């Protein structure tokens, strides 16, 4: 409780960053500004998405696409990811970086809850 988390609220759905607020299933307050109760089985416990993790990032032109984490940067309580796509790196808001069902599934063995 109070830990950073990347979690999904739907089968075959995407993982989004947020925090655990209360233990009920767990109450999740997402960085997107939404809060709701999600299953524990759909919760990844890794605050900084580890280097070289394949993720889904929202580029400046408003398209989500797959990329790879190459670096983190914490600027006064706000994280930014350095994501590489096709050889080019860009900086992304924490809320801009998400995980697909597969991308999230790869991390389950190591950072899964329970």
């Amino acid at each position: 409780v109070g830990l950073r988390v990347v979690a999904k609220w739907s089968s075959n759905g995407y993982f989004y960053s947020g925090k655990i607020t209360r233990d009920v299933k767990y109450k999740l307050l997402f960085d997107d500004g939404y809060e709701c109760d999600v299953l524990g089985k759909d919760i990844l416990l890794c605050d900084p998405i580890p280097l070289d993790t394949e993720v889904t990032a929202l580029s400046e032109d408003e398209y989500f696409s797959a990329g790879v984490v190459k670096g983190h940067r914490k600027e006064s309580g706000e994280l930014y990811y350095s994501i590489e796509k096709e050889g080019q790196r860009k900086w992304y808001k924490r809320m801009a970086v998400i995980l697909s069902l597969e991308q999230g599934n790869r991390l389950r063995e190591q950072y899964g809850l329970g």
């Binding site: 995407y14 997107d32 939404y34 408003e62 398209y63 989500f64 696409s65």
Partner: protein
């Protein structure tokens, strides 16, 4: 079947399976099917470009290859 994201006014970002020839009415209807939002209470945009009824996704050159998934937004 191409995947798009749609950001609701609640902050919640949902997904939708659309055809490139799907009219904006169809997409709003899907949004109604997933979020109960009446289509008449929907204002879609992509990259500052208004998505209006009577037109289609191909009209706006939104969708590209399967790798890219556009983030649509509901305005206020």
């Amino acid at each position: 079947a191409m995947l798009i994201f749609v950001k609701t006014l609640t902050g919640k970002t949902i997904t939708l399976e659309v055809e490139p020839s799907d009219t904006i009415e169809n997409v709003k209807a899907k949004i109604q099917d997933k979020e109960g939002i009446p289509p008449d209470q929907q204002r879609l945009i992509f990259a500052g470009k208004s998505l209006e009824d009577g037109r289609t996704l191909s009209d706006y050159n939104i969708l590209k290859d399967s790798k890219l998934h556009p983030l649509l937004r509901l305005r206020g």
